[model samples]
Target: MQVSVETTQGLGRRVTITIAADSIETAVKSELVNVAKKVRIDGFRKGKVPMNIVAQRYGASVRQDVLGDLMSRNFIDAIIKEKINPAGAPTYVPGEYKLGEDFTYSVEFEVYPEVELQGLEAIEVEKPIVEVTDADVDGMLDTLRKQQATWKEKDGAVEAEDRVTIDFTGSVDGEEFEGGKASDFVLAMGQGRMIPGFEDGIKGHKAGEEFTIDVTFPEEYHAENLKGKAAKFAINLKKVEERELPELTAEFIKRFGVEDGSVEGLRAEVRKNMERELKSAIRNRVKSQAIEGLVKANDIDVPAALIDSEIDVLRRQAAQRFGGNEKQALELPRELFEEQAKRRVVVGLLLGEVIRTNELKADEERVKGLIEEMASAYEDPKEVIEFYSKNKELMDNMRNVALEEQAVEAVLAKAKVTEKETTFNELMNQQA
Candidate 1:
């Protein structure tokens, strides 16, 4: 076998490989011998079949199989011989195989760029210091209490936080639209579950009153047909109900699977859970900002193949989330996901370079601690921990995350970092 490689562009390469005729002939002869051992003939025993007859009967198939086997077996050897590390899978050009002649084919692919690290320490970022307050804990408790709340039929008009049951049909220019008509639809006022301006229109509506409400959908509304369109809803107020939250007592605790059933215990659990959640949220925000800052500071060319592969992964994830076919998934503007995929690939390459250049290593102990923390939430904590512990790949992925966290901290120490104290509510509301 012979191999030749040429640099096409930054991180791009084209490889041309030629398989010798002697290798092909050896493979073909070996395959025919194996076939001859098992194949039966009408007038001869399987192993006793004439070589010429076997060649006449299955020579074409043997030749094709040998050529395929040769390519599959030698492709990796060729790649290694050329010393190329492909960033992703290569596209192989099918070769035409001829008996007693060499077979040649070409492969096109991209490799990881030779990363030169610079300006990493000069990046500027702000790590928000969010404090989880007592008020935030109270707010979370209130939300939990509301989840256990019951509705009571009220005697007057529907107000904010009230539940309303109604029949309504929405129309634009006297034409009814899809998802615009419903009977006995129960809507909780101020929930914001419906389209923008929908919940607001239902507020202050009295029971037994029939009214027409005019509203316009937002420009970026989910429904494309309804976006920026004016619609009038013919609504009948059937019943208005007020919310009555359950008392935070032993019974309430029992309902939440807490057998101890003490308000103090519940409050402590809520606070602990809130703290855990706040820590996670804050870390995510900080890390995202840090990565974005790093990328901006070190503008590098990412391999197109890597970006394309990442885009494919993003598309698959989107399809799973949307629960649709490729066409439905692709309905989202390609540019939206392509930009995200490109960012991911660039950041990945940048972080990898930082790790390689600085001889940085992820703290395995920190990774194990994270796994333990995660497992604590499950019923079979040990089993969960053991599962990750037993899988090297899974543990390595966790370790990579830890390494990135360490890298972020390192960058934060050197870069101009502005710190701002924020409340949990404010931090949560901040847009990505």
Candidate 2:
């Protein structure tokens, strides 16, 4: 066998492998021997068929099967011998095989780009320092209290924070459409649960009142049939109820699983949880900024095959989430997820190069620390930790995340980092 490679781009290569005629002849003879043991002819006993008969009867099938098996087995060996690391599967152009001719074929693929270290000291990033306040704790407490609030029937007219029971039907162009009518629907005013004008229109309406209101659908509505269409909702107001918030007493505190049944105890728990969340949020934000800065500082050619493979993975994930119907899920103007996948591949390749060049080792201690921190919220901490530890792949994923953090710190050490102070509430609102 003989093999030669051609470079097409930064990480793209075309390889041509030629199988000698002698090799093909040897394979055919070996396959014929194996087939002879299983062949049964009219004049011969089972497992006693002649070689000539076996060749004549099952030669074509055996040849095709042997060739395919030989190609798949030898392809990896050839790549290893050539010392090529491919990013994904290669596209093979099968060669022709004849009784006495040499077989030849070519395969094309792209590899991860080889990078050189540069500009590590010039990258700059900002790390945010969040400070939790008493007001932040109060805000979270208020949100929890609102979740436990109830509504009771009232005698007066419907107002903000009041629930109204109504029956309504909507139509466009004198034709009723699907999802255009509801019976005995309870909507709360100022809840923004329905369309923009829907909840507001029910506000200040009295019980036993009948009214017709004109509502226009938003231009970018989810349902294309209802976009920018005007419809009339004929409503019948049946009942109205006012919201009643529970008092912040021992009962309310107990409702939140506070063992001491005190508002102070509840506030302390809320404050602790909020502080932990804020710290995590700050770390994620810093890590994202660090990755973006690294990508901006490096200018390297990423392999096309890697990008294509990443795009395929992204599409599969999207299909799974959206019922695997590409046409229905692709109504948007841009393929945002595909672009994101490509960026991830590029950034991943760059980070891998850095890891190789710096000889960075994953910090297992830090990974264990993170795992323990995550498990603190669970009832069985040891069980959760053991589960992740038993799975090598999951541990490797966590190690990669830790390696990225180390890389970030390495970059931060050399770069100009500015510290910005932010309130805990404001920091929590900034998602990664």
Candidate 3:
């Protein structure tokens, strides 16, 4: 066999291999001999077929099969011989075949790039020091109260946070559009659920009043026909209601599943939940920065095939998130995920290099702790923990995650880390 390797493009390799006719014929003969022993031909007893007859009857088909297996065998052998690691399946192009002649085939594929570790000590990490204070719990308490609030009708001008019942007909250029007209529509004014200026226009309007508000639909409106279109909504205010929050009482505490029904019990639960959230928030924030630093420190060409594979994973995940089938998720333009996918691939490569260089293994104790942390939020923590422990795929995934976490910590260990005192709200609000 003759093998040749060529670099066709960035990270792309083309391998051309040729097998001599003697070897090909030998493999074909060997295969034919096996077939001859298994065959029961006409005018011949089982395993008694003549070699020449077997050749004549099965040579054509045997040669085709031989070539297919031979190509794969030699292709792998050639890549191994050349010390080339393929990032994805190759595209094979076979040359013309003739008996007693060399058969050649070429496969093109991308290879993973070599990443050299550097600048580990220069990666800056800002570790957030946040405490879930009583004030934060109070804020959460207020939000929870609003969630349980009831609306009370009042005779007054509309205000922000008021629920208003209104009759409205929206038209663009004097023509009404689909979903542009409704009667007795109940809108929560401050929710910002409507188009820009819709809620704002309703605010300050009195009940039993009729008025017209001219507004422009946003450029990225979901409705294509109404996007960036100026429309007038003739509003007829029917009534307005304001939210009335219930007082913090034993009943209120019990409503939130706090069995003790004590104010302190509710506060403690809220505080604990907030601390858990704060811890995760701080870890994610710091980890993101560390990853960003790692990416900035290393500049390497990533294989397009790997990025494409990552994009497919992201597309499927997006489908799971956005309530669509796989086909529709794939149709959600690749451009939307290209940048994110590229960054993810880069991070994976960097983390892989870090893990390799450090000879890092996932810590079993940390894996258990991580599983317990995740399961803590569920109803039955022990059951959730057992579920993760019993599932091979879940355990393998957790191991991978633990390895990744260790890799990040490996980076952070050598990185320049400084504690940044930040409030819970500030740290959580610094979401990208």
Candidate 4:
């Protein structure tokens, strides 16, 4: 047996292996001898089957199996001997295989490239330095109150934040269309849930009034027929209402985990939650900038095979996200996530290289801290921590996250970081 390796292209390798006729014949004979010992032929007693007869009966099937097993072993052995790491499984290209002649086969695969790390010092990151304030907490409280608010009928013109009830019919080119009309349609004046020009046309209208508003559908409207078409709406305003915010009463305060039922306690709890979320949000934001900068400044040719595998991973992840509706999940087009998948692959490769070259380790304390932080949101934090401690796979996943955090910090240590002041709302807005 002989093995040879060749560089096919960028990060690609071709391994050619040859098995001589004597070697093949010897292995086939050995296999036949082993099978003859356990022969179960009706005309022959146990262990008495002739070697040639056994060979005649099972030789073809046995050789097929032996060749498959041998090829895999030889292929793996060759790569190890050559000291090469394959990024993906090999594609076997069979040349020829005869009963008594030298057989030839080749395996083609991709190997990981040497990542030349760059821009570590030049990568600029804006670290958001935010502080939770009383005003900020109060603003959050107002937002919470609005979520539990009610609407009451108002007397004058419809304002931007006001809600209105109307009976209306809309038509394009003097003909009514599907989903073009509704009765008692409740619409918020500034909410952009409807098509552009439709909601804005309803602004400043009053109750018990009838009017017609003319508007044009956007060029890229979802309905092909309505695209760029002029439409007329006959409106009947039934009610005009303004939002009435709820007060931070005892019950409202208690609803937010304030057992004391004090408004100040609620505020304190809100501040605590906001600080926690803001810390995570700020870290994620800076990490995102660091990775993006690294990807933009560094040049690395990502392997096609790796990207394809990553695409499968993304598809599986998305499919599983729909509660095991695997069939429905697979129906989503792969192109929808191609760009995101590519970015993910690139960022992962760079980070992996950084982790390897910098000797960044997944520390135990950081892993525990990460798990504790995650478990903080649950009612049973101790149980969550215990669950993570028991499940190695789950803990390993957390470790990878923490190790990636270490990698980001490794970069930030050498990066040009500027501390910028950002409010909690602004930091959370760019969470993606």
Query: What is the C-alpha lDDT profile of model 1 across 1-432, one tens digit per residue?
Result: 445766544443444344566764566567655654554433355556666557557756765555566556566756788886664566665567676875555545335466776775576676777554788668867766445644344544444554467778877878888777777777776656666667887665566677787788766444668778888877766654544444433444554533344667666765666678677777887777777766766666667767766876787686775565564554565565777788888777777777786778888877888999878665568999999899999998888778878876766676787788765556665345
In model 3, the worst 10-residue window by lDDT is: 242-251
What does candidate 4's lDDT look like per residue over 311-411, in tens digits?
76676786675355554544555665666777888888887888888787889997877788768656678998998899999988888877877888887
- Find the number of clashing residue pairs for candidate 1: 0
Number of the top candidate by TM-score?
3
Writing each residue's lDDT as its tens digit, candidate 3 over 187-306 gives 776666676577887765566677788888766443568878888876665654543444443444454542343566566666677677666677788877777776777777777878
Colliding pairs, model 3: none
> How accurate locally, in lDDT, is each candidate?
0.66, 0.64, 0.68, 0.66
Cα-lDDT of candidate 1: 0.66
Instruction: Candidate 1: give the clashing pairs.
Output: none
lDDT score, candidate 3: 0.68
- lDDT for 265 in candidate 4 is 55
- Report the C-alpha lDDT of model 2 over 1-432, residue by residue, as the tens digit: 445766544343444344566765576667645544545443354557666557557756765565566556556767788887764556565556676765545545335456666776766677776554788668866766555544344443454544467666776777788875787677766656677777777655556677767788777454668889887766655654443444443444553432443456566666666678666677777767777777788766666667666766666666665465564443442344556766788777766766786777898988999889767655578998999899999999988878887876665676788888765556554533
After superposition, candidate 1 runs with Cα above 4 Å error: 1-3, 7-106, 129-151, 154-262, 324-333, 378-400, 420-429
Between prediction 1 and prediction 2, the one with superior TM-score is: 1
After aligning candidate 4 to the native by TM-score, how far in Å is the CA of 399 from where it should be? Answer: 2.1
- When 1 and 3 are scored with lDDT, the better candidate is 3
Q: Candidate 2 or 4, higher TM-score?
A: 4
Best by lDDT: 3
